[PDB]
Amino acid sequence: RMTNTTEEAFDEVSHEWQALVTSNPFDLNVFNYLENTQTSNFGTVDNPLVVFTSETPFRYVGCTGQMNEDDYEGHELLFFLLREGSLQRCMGCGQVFKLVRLRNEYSPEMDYYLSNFHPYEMQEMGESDTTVLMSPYKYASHYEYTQFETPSNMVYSMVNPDEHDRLLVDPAYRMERTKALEEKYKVYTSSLREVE
Amino acid sequence: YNFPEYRTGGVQANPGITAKRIIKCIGERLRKYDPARWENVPITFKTHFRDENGYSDVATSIQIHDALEREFGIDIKDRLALVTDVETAFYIVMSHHDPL
Amino acid sequence: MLATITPVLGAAVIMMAFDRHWQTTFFEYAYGGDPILSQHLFWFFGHPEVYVLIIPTFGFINMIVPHNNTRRVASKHHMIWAIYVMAYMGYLVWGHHMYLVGLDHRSRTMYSTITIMISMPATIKVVNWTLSLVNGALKIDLPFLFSMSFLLLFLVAGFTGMWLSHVSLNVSMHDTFYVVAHFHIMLSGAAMTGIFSGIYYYFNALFGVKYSRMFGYMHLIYYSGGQWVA
Amino acid sequence: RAGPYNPNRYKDYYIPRTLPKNEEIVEFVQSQHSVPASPIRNQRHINPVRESGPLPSYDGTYTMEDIRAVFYNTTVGRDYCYCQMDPEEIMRRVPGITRKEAEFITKLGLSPQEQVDFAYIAYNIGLDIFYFTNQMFVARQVVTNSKGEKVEVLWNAQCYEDIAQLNVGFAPVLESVDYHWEIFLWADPPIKPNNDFDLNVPCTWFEYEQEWWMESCIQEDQFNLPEDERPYNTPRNPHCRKELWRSQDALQEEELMVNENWYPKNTQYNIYNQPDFIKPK
Amino acid sequence: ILKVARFRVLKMRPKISTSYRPHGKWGDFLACIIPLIWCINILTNSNLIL
Amino acid sequence: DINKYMESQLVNDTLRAFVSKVGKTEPATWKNYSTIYHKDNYEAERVRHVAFVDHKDPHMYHGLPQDYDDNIKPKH
Amino acid sequence: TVINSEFLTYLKSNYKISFSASNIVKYLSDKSVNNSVILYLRKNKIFNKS
Amino acid sequence: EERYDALRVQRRIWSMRFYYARQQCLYELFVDHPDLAQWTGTYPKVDSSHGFPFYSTYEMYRDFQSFAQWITL
Amino acid sequence: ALFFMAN
Amino acid sequence: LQEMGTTSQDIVINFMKEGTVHHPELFEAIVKGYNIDTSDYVINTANNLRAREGNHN
Amino acid sequence: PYTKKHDDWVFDVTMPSQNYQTDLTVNIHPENKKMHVMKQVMRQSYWDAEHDMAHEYDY
Amino acid sequence: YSKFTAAIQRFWKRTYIIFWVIEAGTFSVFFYLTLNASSEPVYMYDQIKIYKTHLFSWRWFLIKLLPSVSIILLGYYLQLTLKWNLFNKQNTIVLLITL
Amino acid sequence: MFRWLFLYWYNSTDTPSAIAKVNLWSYINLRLFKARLSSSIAYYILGLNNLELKKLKIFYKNTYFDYIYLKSIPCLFLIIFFTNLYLFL
Amino acid sequence: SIPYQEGKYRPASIPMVAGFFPYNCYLQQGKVYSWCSCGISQSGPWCDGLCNSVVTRCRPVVF
Amino acid sequence: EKWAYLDYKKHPSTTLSHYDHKSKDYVESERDDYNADVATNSHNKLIDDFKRNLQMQRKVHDILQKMDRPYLRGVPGVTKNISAGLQDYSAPVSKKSQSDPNDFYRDAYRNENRWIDQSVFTPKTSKMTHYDVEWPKELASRPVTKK
C-alpha cells in the first residue's frame, strides 16, 4: 500500500514523500494540512509571529488580535498582505509578523524552524484499500482502515532527475547504486551505535 | 500598640516568613483533617501531599486551599491549580496580589 | 437549508409528473391520494426558499455599514444567532401558507405561534443595524444609501408579514394582493436593494473601475421610489 | 513570443552526485555528536517589554489627562488646522523629540492637542513621521529590540474581513490599479494564525484604550459636580485607615517567625525533633 | 437619526471606535421585550375572533 | 532555598531594567516566568509592581528602569 | 561492519562524544539493517506550492 | 457555624473531585484522540509555557458556544 | 391585551 | 473659524460683561488681532484641571 | 504589477514647508492658495492585444 | 504518475461519498412517502386495507439475494489478493464478476 | 524516543542538514512518531528559579472488575435494605 | 493602586458615575478589597481589571 | 566560537564570471541573481547575529556576576538561607534518575542565556568530500546560456 517511490513518485508524489520522510520546513510547509496549522505565540518585536512561505514573495495574513478564552478572537478579522523583507505589525493590536521565505535547502537556518510544523500525517499516504467509511458518527474525522500492513523497512535516498532517469532505464546502475547505498546505511548505523 | 506597616506587599517582601506561615497553616489543617496520617510527619518546604506514585488527592488539596484562604485572606481558584506541595502553595500565595 | 429542502421539492414535482403522465393518482382523492400532500411538500420546500432568498441580503447590509462607519458591528454573534434561529424555525412555519385548506386547529396554532415568534430574531437584526449606525466615523457612500433604502423596505415588509400571521386577519388577507404587496416589498425592494448595495460595494472588484456617481444616484432614487409607489 | 517551456528537461543539482566515504561517514557522525547542535526555535517570551513605549505618567510633562482631552475633540475635515503649536513647546512636552520632528508635526493638519499627542506617540514608539501612507504600508517605525538590532517594523494597509476589498499592490500609491484574475497565484493558501494561550503576552500596544471609546461615549452626556460643591474632609470610617489592618496577634506571630529557630510548638508530637519541645496537652 | 445625520460624519465630530469586541449585559433580553408584547397582542386578538 | 528565590528576583529585575534601557521602554509583565494562574495573558489584570504613597516616596521608581543607572546599577 | 582500532583511537582522541544521538536508527541491529529497502525520491525543482 | 463551614468544604470537595476527574478525561482525550476532542469543544489542554508548540493542536470548534437557547427550548 | 385599546 | 472641523466665514462671538478677563493686556491684544511676543515666559507646573471638568455651565 | 510612485508629500500649496510657528512678522493666509496643475484621477490600464495574447498563449 | 497525492485521494473519497449521499436523499424521501402512503378511510371507503399487509415470502427473497452477495464476496477476494497476484491471474475473478 | 518537547528540541542531531549529509532517510525516524506526551495532566507553575512541571493524576485506569464488585457491596446492601424497609413501611 | 485616603479623596480624573446609589456590601475583617475608582468595572464595586483598559488616572483603592 | 563555523560565504559573483555584473560574461537572470543574493546574505547575517549575540551575552553575564546582592545582608530565614545552610530531610532509598525533567529545564532554559539560546550556527563537524568539495565543484561547473 506504500508507494514504490523508485518507479512511481515523480513530482508531487515525490515532493510529498520528501516532506513526510525529511520533515524539511520547505517541503513540510508546502504539504501542511489545510485543516490545522500549528498554533504559535503572540507576535512581538523580540518574538515575532512567523508566517512561512515556500519561496513565494508574500502571503495573505489575517489578524484577530490577542485571542482569549472567553471570546476566541481579540478583534475583528483584519487581512493584509504580509510581504518579505522586514517585520510588519497589525496596527489594531500591535502583533508583529515576520514572513520567513523558506528555501529548498538543508541549511541549519531551515532546521531552526523545525518545531513550527505539525509532523506530516502518514495515514493518507500510499494507496487506500477502503474508499470511505459509511458510518455517519465516524466520518470526515477518522481515516479509512486498511486490510494490509504498513512496512517500516524503507530507507529513502534523494536522487537528481537525470540520475533517476538513468536508474529507471538502467537496471545494472540501479543495482550498483542500491548496493552502495546499503553499504552506506550499514556504515551510518554502525557509527551511530559506536557514538551511543 | 503596634502600628501595622504602611507599605503594601509585605507578603512578597518576606519569602521566609510567608513560607513559615504557609507551613504552619497547612500543618494545622492537615493534622486536624487527617490526624492518622499527618500527626507524626513534619511538614517542611519540600513536603508534598501526593501518593508515592505522584497521584494527588483532591480532598486533601481542597482542605489546603481552604486553609490558605483563611490564613492569608485570599480566594484560591481551585479550577486553575491544585496545591499538592508546599512549593505550589508558596507559588499561589506569592502570585496573589492581595495576601495579608 | 437548500441541501435540506431540495429533495422534498424534487420528489413533489416528480410525483406530479408521474400523476400527469402515468395516472398514478398521487393527488387524486378518489382512490386513496390526497391533494393536500402536494401543498405540504411544496410549502415545506417553499418557506425555506424565501428564507434562503432573504438572508444573504442581511449579509450585504452587515458589511457596508461597518465599512463606512469605521466601527465594529453592534454584535456579530447575536446577528449570526438570529439568522440561525430564523433558519431553524423556518422549517416549522410552512403551514402558515395553508391556513384555510382545512388543517387541524392544533397545527394552525403551532404554525401561527412559531410564525409570530419569528419577529424576535428579526428584531435583533434591526436593533443591531441601528446600534451599528451610531457612535462612529461615518463616510456617506452609494452602497450606504442603498443599505438605508434596504433597511426601510425590510422594516415595512417584515411588519406587514408579521401582521399576516394574525389568523383572523389572514383569513381575509389570504390569497389577496396584501400578500403580494408584503412579499413584493420584501423580495423586490429589500433583496434587490441589498443586491445593488453589494454591486456598488464590489464594483471595483467586479469591473476593475470605479462607478459613476450621477447615474448611480439616479438609479437609487428611481428604483426606491418605484418600489414604494408600486 | 517566447516558445514552449518544460523545466523538467533541464538538470537540477540539489543532491551531490557522489557518495560519501565510509570513514568520512564515521568521522562526521563522531564530530556532530562531539559538539552542540544548532538551536531550534523557541516561542517563549523571556522578558516582554511594552510595544507602545513607556506607560503614560500620573504627573509629568505629558500625562493621561492630555490623552482624554485629545479624545473629546476628534474631527477629520477637508482642510488643515493651520494653527501651529510652537516646536519649542512640543520639544518641552516630549523631551526626547528633535527639532525637525516637532517642526514637521506642526506642518501637518492636526490641531495643537493632536500635534502634541502625535509627537508623544511618535517619539515613544519610534515612529517615522516622514513616511508617506500608501496601500502597501501605512506606517514605518524603527525600534531596537532586546538584542539591540535596531530593526524596522512596517504597519501594513489592512482590510476589514474582505480580501476582495484588499489593495494587493506593490506601489507606494493609494489607488487600486492592479487587478488579479488568480488571487492565489501559486496555490499557496492565506493564513489566519491562531495564538496559543500559554504563549500569549500581556497587551501592551496601547492597552489603555480598549474601553476608552465606551467610557468617552458615556461621559459626553454626564454632568460632573464641581470641586467647589463636592463635600470634602468628611469623617473617617471607624474601621478603615490608610495602613492595611493587621491584628496584634498576627503582628506578634510575624515577630516570632522572624526568629530562625521558629517551629509551630502546637503539635501533639515532637515532629520537628526540637530539643525544647513540651507536650501541650 | 439626528445624531448620525449631524454629528457622525468625518467633518462633524467622528468617534474613535476603540472597542475590539462587544461585551453586553443581557442584550437580546432588551431587544425581545418589544416584539414579545406584539406577539401577545396579536395572539390575544386572534383568539377572541376565533 | 531562599537564596535561589532572591537571586532569581534580583536577576530578573536587572534583566528587565537592562532590556528596558536598551529598548527605551518599560517592562510588560513584571512576572519572571509566564504561567497561567492569573490569566494576565488574555485578561486585563496586569502584574505590574509599582507601589508608592506620595510624590516624595523614595520607593516610587522601584520596579521601573528609571531606578537603574546607565551602567545598570541597582540604585539611582 | 568492522571499524579499525587505530581509526577508533584517532576518532576518540580528536572528538569526545558529549551528546547523544537523536536518530532512532541507533537502536537498529545488523539483522534489521540488512532487511531495509532503499527507495529513491526524485528531487527536482518545485513549482506547485500546494 | 462550624457545621455549615464543614458542609461548604465538603460540597467544594465533591465539586472539585468531579471537576478534576473530568479534566483528566478531557486531557487524555485531547492527547490521544484529537479529532473527537475538537468535535466535543475541548480546548487545547497541553501547557506550552516552555515555548515549544504542541505537535498536534487544532482550531476550536465551538458549535454550541441566551435568547437562542430560550426560543429553541 | 391588558390595555391595548387604551380606553 | 474652524468649528468641529468645518471652516465657516464671518462668525461673530461674544464676550459677556459678567466674565473674568485675566491678563487684560493679552486679552486686548488678541481681540485687536496682535501677534503677542511671548519670549519672556515661565511655566507653572500646576496639574489642577481634569478632562471634562465641571464648570457651572 | 504597478510599481510607480506618483504620490508623495505635498507642501507650499496652503501649508508652507518653511517654519513660521514662532515668527511674529509672518501670518499664514491659506485662502491665498495659488493655482497648481490639476491632478486627474488615475486612468485605468488599457490592454495591449498582441502582448496579452502572446503572454497568455499556451503551447 | 506525479498527480495522485494524498489530498487528491481524499478528494476522490469525499467525491464518492458525496455522490452517494446526494443519490440517497431523493430515495430517502420516496421511501418515507412509501412507508406512510396515503389511503382511503378504513371505515367505509377502504375496509380491506387492514388485511393488505403486502408481506413477501422471505424464502423467495433469500433465493433472490444470491448473485449480489456473490459479487460482494468475489470483489472482496479480488481486492485482498491484489497484494500478491497479477492481472492475468485475476482476470478470472474480474470476468466472473462481470458475468 | 522522547516524552517532552523541551527535551526533544533541545539538542537534535537527526536534523535534515546531517541526514542530508548522509542522505539516508529511514522510515522509522519519522517525526510523526518521535515525540508523544504522557496523557496525564502536566502543567507549569513558577518555582524558585524557573518553571516547575506539576503532574495532575487523579485516578488509575487499570482497575479490574473485582475491585468494582467489592466496592459495590455496601451500595447493593443499602439498596436491599431500603427496598425492604419501603415494603414493610 | 492608591491607599485609603481617610475622608480626603479627590479623583485623579473624572470617573464614570456608574450609579447614584451606594452598594450595601458585607466586608470581611482583615481581607484586602480593591475598590473600583474608574467606575467601568463589570465586577460591581470592585476593581476587576478594566482600569488598565481605559485612559484614566483613577486607580483602585486597596483598603 | 569553538562550536561553530564562522566562515563568511562569498557571493558567487567573485568566483563565477556570469554572476559578475561587469565581466562581459554576465547573464542577466533575475531569479538566479536573487537566489544567490538571498543565500549569501542569509548565511552572513546568521554569522553576524551569532557574533553580536555572543558579545551581548558576555556583557549581560558580566553585569550579572558583579551586581550587588542585598539579599545576602538580610535576616537569615527571611531573605536568606538559614545560618545552618540548606538541609535535606528526606531519606532516599535509591539513586535518582538523570532524566528528571524539572532539573534539566531549570538548568537549560534560562532568561540569562537568552542571547545565545537562539543563535543559529553551523556546527564544527568534520568536512565531507562529496558534500563540501565535490558538490560545490559540480554547482560551479554548471553550463549557462543567455538564450
Ligand code: HEA
Ligand atoms: C424572502 C421573502 C420573504 C420574507 C423574508 C418573508 C418573511 C415573512 N413572511 Fe412571508 N411570504 C413570502 C415572502 C417572504 N416572507 C412569499 C413569496 C409569500 C407567498 C406564499 C404564497 O403564495 O402563499 C409569503 C407568504 C406569507 C404568509 C402567508 C400569506 C398567505 O397565506 O398568502 C405569511 C403569514 O402567514 C407570511 C408571513 C411572514 C412573516 C411573519 C415573515 C417574517 O420573517 C418577517 C420578519 C420581520 C419582522 C417581523 C421584523 C419587523 C421589524 C420591525 C422592528 C417591525 C416594526 C416596524 C414597523 C412597525 C414598520 N408570509
Ligand code: FES
Ligand atoms: S476598573 Fe475601576 S479601578 Fe479598576
Ligand SMILES: [Cu+2]
Ligand atoms: Cu412562509
Ligand SMILES: [Zn+2]
Ligand atoms: Zn491584530
Ligand SMILES: [Zn+2]
Ligand atoms: Zn474520532
